[PDB]
Design a binder for this molecule. Structure first.
Ligand code: HEM
Ligand code: HEM
Ligand code: HEM
Ligand code: HEM
Lengths: 468, 461, 460, 461
């Protein structure tokens, strides 16, 4: 019975998984890892292509997997609650995702396939590739060149147990599917214990928030959200599953991209940038990313502050000319925190324009691959397994990459591409002295390579359980 | 060339140790641990009485110690910078302090001895004892009953190495001095990794800030400064060293007090208070201290809320009647945040009484245990004027029953003598009930010292 | 050159990898993990079926794998030496094995396929199954019911890294092969840090030894060799690779069996046995296995004694009537230490030994009691499967009359189960009958050959 | 009752601390750390000189320390038992030792002072120094140049708590004694978790054994002692305390020596030796010490075996020509395992020279580093006769060039003065080459003490 209103407006404290009220049925039929990350230290990603002419036994397998393993949002919350209260660790965590091709394999009518246009086109689609600035599909890792039908995600803190359970699951799975690709994701940490990505920066700091446990935690640590509200409405991440079987059956769209990071070359380019500007290497890093390695926002400081829990309580209102945090910095390109509402609004509707800007946000659930020692500097074979959720790929991930990160004239003319993820690489203007207007041009090179991926839908659990 | 102006007004971002500008010479000749704490996990405190008739060899020893070991504020900042940037751990940290009696031992002329009156009088002085409400000197631990000339402080994160270095240092030291007392300080922590004191409360939260690294961290991570500005001027902590060699030779006055904490009895009294008011035990704690054990200010909340960086950008403007945080609570007694001004001139004066705390713990290192005796706080603080700062805070704020208002009662944590407080029955409502919270902290000994400029110590012989 | 003499007689200190003498060329072309275990904490086992009509590209893949990853015995020894001397870890460990079906897929002429008869027949063969007392092939786990061509084994101490490297390897591999089954092996330990198996017993103690580093360690730290000599000749494990590129090209035959252990039921049966005999649970365990859980040989003691290096320099000469260690106990069945010879007969008895390279699967917490899904990935090497593993199972463990009439089957591994006679009091003759049940289930496996490296490097 | 027989013959399984039988009174009145090491990870050593004319208050202090802190052998065993059985940690461990000078300070009559001649002479005695090959007393560290009366030893696994307890103990102690020197001992370990000394070799492997727990553990791990019996009779370590309160009152003589180890130079010398002989560096180490770094005996192997618990089950009967383990190697010099008997009576006499080691490390705690000075071994050992045990071992075995055979040369590790050894070119073959391995251990000070019975100390005042 959830209305338009209920989906467009998050409660003030978020959705309370212990007292869900009208969101109870939703949480029971929605898969986990969407509204709140599964939080497990290890994961396995199995990309599947179902075997020809085996539709009925495939459906039986999916059904059994949904009955036995898939974790709902309610189950995810209950497992976290039982762990905190009684030290009892829960079952493995599991998600199941379908591509558009997967829906076709399953003989679901076109009109019943999730409607998102990028999801239907697929990440190999030439128009999609062109719009993202992505490389040719022939450059992708072999696993991703196959037609992918589905993704199985299994996660757990105990790696050896995770491997055993995966090996059990795969016995029946292999009868009906080719496993065309596998990843074993993990969480990289720095010596302070912060979660980082391979270039050494704390990662996952700024997220749309939905669940009470997150909202309340973030509020107490971010000054009552007095500079930035991280809450987001449910309709920025959920969509009705057109084939769900409850009054409140929802899913979300997944973007999966394997992003290789050339750490050695990145560090060299960062040092060179620092030498050219005659600044500290750590500040050069902060100008590229928008934060110091520890998470300190460069809009707020020209030095790292080393807080283990970095602040998210800022906007760029004290930095309108972007002489502290440049317009090109990754954080400011991907989350303008109002820049588009000021700079690109001429009818004066700041509030409406800011709401629209905020509607482009993505909910990240990324993990690392490759080298697990963060002191090392891999050239290839290490990076980020980029996963994010949204209700509209065209308006969220694709928008963020194609309209914000890539273009040289966003948010203002001659900003240049995002030096971390913008394709193609180009020219940025860097402040010589933090907080002062004079800049110098430097072409920071793109040290991230797209190695493959796909768009999926996370269906409602009831859909999956009644497929056979 | 630092002027009156430079000393009375801190720069907006504090003193930048990596780009010190006009403060460069000051930072080279000022000892560390004053403007910013040494931050090491372990320390050794050696209290000295120099041996009679050995003035010249004592001076030679002090000179060698200053040349080899003493850490300047600049060196301290450089060691932290090298550690962050390259993982290289620095030398051991060291301070050296002299008492007035120590200056006299060294045959320094009276006009050249630091001028602070409490420092000159000494912590054993009867007037000082009476003013502080302190116990009789005959009750102090034996080590502190000796005439103390100096204090050597050595600190390091690696405890075993620290002990070896100390044992090396003490070989030549014992030739020229009696070590009359030793402490081995350490940092107590809660399960979240926050620094606490033996009663279980997060500790060292609210400080005067001077250095850029501290000022910016606080501003960025603790919600800016619009309710409470933690910056302080240099003249609230530094004093020109009358015997320094440089144009910018400064020191500071140290108060050292060994404060024994009866954890078992404190917890019992806290439970009895809670049960008398029919409130949660954690809230009873918060009414005694002014914060919950997790650091949550009781003026802002009647429950703990677990902020990772405990809140400090607040004042009592939403709590004028003190029915959330009582006037008697330790934090509100020791930092009234404008109560005395209730303006601008009066608040500046009020803020001039602040102290810069550099305390460490002694005794039991397992924070789950409940020692009765032999555990507590090695209370160290710095200031430019002991009469106006530590002594003022203890004698005029914490102890009196009529500060800040009539019948407030003494600070139930540190006030001497103990007395009667009025406790709100319901947080945020006016009705109170009287309860005599007992004093569970005992003064076991201490002394006042001066941290001299490094150049003074390096050219003493 | 290696002569018959060199293969039939191990040097007194074993083969010295750092000064190999006449064995130098052999160690260069022989895969690791055979003469000495790879010693890595984690492993991944990938069972392969090559895709139809892709023989040439399969050969190219195998060749690249042999050039890039396969660890020789010389490389294995060098990696251990560099690790001890300089702390440098070095590469992942890798083996590659072929089944007879794999040889046929690769269009290798029959006269060139390794000659061992069980190997050629395959572990699914009905005569093999019957001989071993094995269950029907339809009861096997699904992965093992496919026709298996090859096994890729990759191992490393750093599990996360191992997983990344495996995922890299499998990208090109999947183009030319189905991965029909996977295991992730790991090492179970007790609180003292000794390697154990799921029933709780220290495991991997008694082995044929070949390399100096093993021989000397064992001699120095395990009380010399005067009661039991653990050395074995190279011809008890190595076989000439008919397709190697020199006369010094050797391989070995691998037996792989997934053996599920019902820990819960085993412990109950052990407790019931102990109650029936009115003895301590731990002694009942020792009578089943031949050792206490801590490794203490039950022939030597009726109590555990916690030796750090579990004892292996013993025989049953003080226990001829088997009233301390019964004739049915697992250790005494699988290694009679002279019972069958009661000189030439003892040498023959010792020729049946197997070199074990097993690892665990399933539950990694050894305090738990899984019913199914946990056990031992049993791997062993030999030069002659008929005379070694198959002999040990079919002629020693299984039969009721080995080593003497009415001994009964090995209560741990004997198939089918039956009746054992158990001493009421250790060291005294009176026994009582009890049918210990079989709590190990064969879930699948295959026989393979580990070829010489030069064969694999020049296959395309 | 204890008879001559009981003291000259250890029971087959050693003394059972849980069931002591005839040894019950002995274990109550005997200090710990003698028959079995205290096994604590940290210790503090306080060397004392009692203050002139304060004999009676010194006696009262010693009495209170014996009543409150000193650990008997029985208490030590009970604390270990409770810890294993219930996880309950015990009190700190403590010993108290007196020098001959300390006995004289306490006005104990000469006939009542322990009779051992080296003990009475003192380690500063010129004839003692000459006999040991020791350096001039003026080269010792300053702390050891004082007249030392006593040594207080306090030990615990929890370093911070140990420090606090020591600081408490020293308050009353300082009233009646000068603390002339302090060490903070610790246990150095290699990456495998084995206890090592600074040169990197596993240390403490071969010991005389007395207590059942040790005897049984060692027996099971050493092949039922079939090559070497490590047991020793009680009279090789215990001495009747002439001033104990019963006939079951015993003590032992302590040798304490601070031995500095030049790790950097030792490693260079080892590498030079290896290059000259064209052998592996690890084997060169084994030829110096008698064992590889991991403990593997070089008499048994020319390669390390890396067993975490090294074997002790060997003698040199497979190596009579000493071409595997040279006659000069430290282990073979200090424990010939029958070389001097080459029988039964001579081997018994040879075994009577053994010492029971209770050493700990000082200085650098990171074993990967290579200190030149300031790091080493705090060498402690016990015996019933210093002349026949430690002094005999150093002066008659380690030092002489003609022990055990002509032109063996000094022990290259500890022999003073240094000289020439003959090293086998190829392990197990006779041809040798001369190389002068240098002495990289420096004696920095020490003293001989007696560990008195507890009853003596408890009734001293
Ligand atoms: C290997 C590739 C990438 C790296 C290393 C990376 C790194 C980071 C870092 C260090 C942060 C700052 C801390 C945080 O809030 O998490 C961040 C934030 C973020 N990144 Fe990325 N990023 C990557 C790819 C992407 C891509 C492809 C997108 C979207 C198209 C994206 C969108 C975001 C967003 C939305 C934020 C949060 C901005 C905010 O709310 O302040 N990132 N990224
Ligand atoms: C064992 C004795 C003491 C204990 C257990 C103790 C405990 C605490 C605690 C828990 C806080 C709150 C957190 C913080 O800001 O650090 C605090 C604050 C403080 N204490 Fe103490 N204290 C002790 C002695 C003293 C003494 C003797 C003084 C001065 C005479 C003092 C002055 C202060 C001041 C100035 C603050 C900061 C108040 C603010 O700015 O809000 N304390 N103390
Ligand atoms: C899950 C199945 C099995 C378990 C739990 C198991 C367990 C053990 C145990 C605890 C030992 C004693 C310690 C040792 O020397 O390793 C051992 C020894 C041994 N086992 Fe097994 N075993 C299993 C299967 C097999 C099979 C199938 C064979 C051969 C057909 C075998 C052959 C041996 C041999 C040869 C020894 C060494 C005996 C000796 O030399 O004293 N085991 N086994
Ligand atoms: C810094 C000085 C010394 C070092 C580094 C050192 C090192 C060692 C090492 C590595 C061992 C072999 C393992 C073991 O403990 O059994 C050992 C054994 C021994 N050392 Fe020392 N040692 C030192 C000084 C001394 C001195 C001064 C003596 C006697 C005068 C001595 C007597 C012994 C004895 C008796 C053994 C055992 C011999 C045996 O029973 O096999 N050591 N030493």
């Amino acid at each position: 019975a959830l209305t338009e209103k209920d989906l467009k407006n998050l409660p003030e404290d978020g959705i309370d998984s212990e007292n869900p009220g009208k969101y109870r049925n939703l949480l029971n039929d929605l898969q986990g890892n969407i509204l709140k990350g599964h939080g497990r230290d290890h994961s396995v990603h199995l990309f599947l292509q179902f075997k020809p002419e085996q539709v009925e036994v495939v459906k039986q397998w999916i059904q059994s997997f949904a009955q036995t393993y898939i974790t709902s949002a309610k189950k995810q919350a209950d497992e976290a609650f039982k762990y905190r209260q009684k030290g009892v660790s829960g079952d493995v965590f599991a998600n199941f995702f379908l591509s558009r091709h997967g829906y076709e394999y399953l003989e679901i009518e076109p009109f019943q396939i999730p409607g998102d246009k990028p999801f239907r086109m697929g990440m190999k689609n030439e128009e999609i590739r062109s719009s993202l600035g992505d490389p040719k599909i022939a450059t992708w890792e072999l696993g991703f060149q196959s037609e992918i039908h589905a993704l199985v995600l299994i996660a757990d803190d105990d790696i050896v147990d995770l491997l055993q359970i995966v090996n059990q699951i795969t016995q029946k799975l292999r009868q009906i599917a080719e496993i065309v690709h596998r990843e074993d994701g993990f969480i990289l940490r720095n010596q302070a214990g912060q979660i980082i990505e391979h270039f050494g920066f704390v990662h996952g700091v700024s997220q749309p928030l939905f669940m009470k446990r997150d909202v309340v935690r973030e509020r107490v640590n971010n000054c009552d959200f007095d500079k930035w509200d991280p809450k987001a409405p449910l309709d920025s991440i959920l969509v009705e599953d057109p084939n769900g079987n409850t009054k409140d059956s929802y899913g979300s769209y997944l973007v999966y991209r394997k992003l290789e990071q050339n750490v050695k070359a990145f560090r060299e380019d960062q040092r060179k940038l620092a030498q050219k500007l005659n600044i500290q290497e750590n500040l050069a890093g902060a100008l590229i990313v928008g934060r110091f390695a520890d998470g300190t926002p460069v809009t707020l400081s020209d030095i790292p502050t080393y807080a283990v829990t970095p602040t998210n309580n800022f906007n760029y209102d004290g930095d309108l000319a972007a002489t502290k945090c440049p317009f090109h910095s990754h954080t400011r390109k991907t989350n303008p925190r109002g820049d588009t509402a000021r700079l690109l609004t001429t009818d004066g509707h700041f509030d409406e324009a800011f709401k629209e800007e905020r509607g482009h946000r993505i909910t990240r659930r990324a993990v690392s691959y490759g080298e697990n020692n963060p002191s090392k500097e891999p050239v290839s074979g290490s990076g980020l397994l980029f996963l994010c959720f949204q209700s509209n790929i065209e308006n969220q991930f694709n928008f963020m990459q194609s309209r914000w990160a890539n273009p040289q004239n966003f948010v203002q003319v001659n900003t240049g591409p995002d030096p971390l993820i913008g394709q193609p690489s180009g020219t940025q203007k860097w402040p010589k002295k933090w907080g002062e207007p004079e800049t110098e041009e430097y072409n920071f090179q793109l040290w991230i390579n797209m190695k493959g991926g796909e768009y999926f839908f996370a269906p409602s659990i009831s859909f999956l359980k009644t497929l056979a």
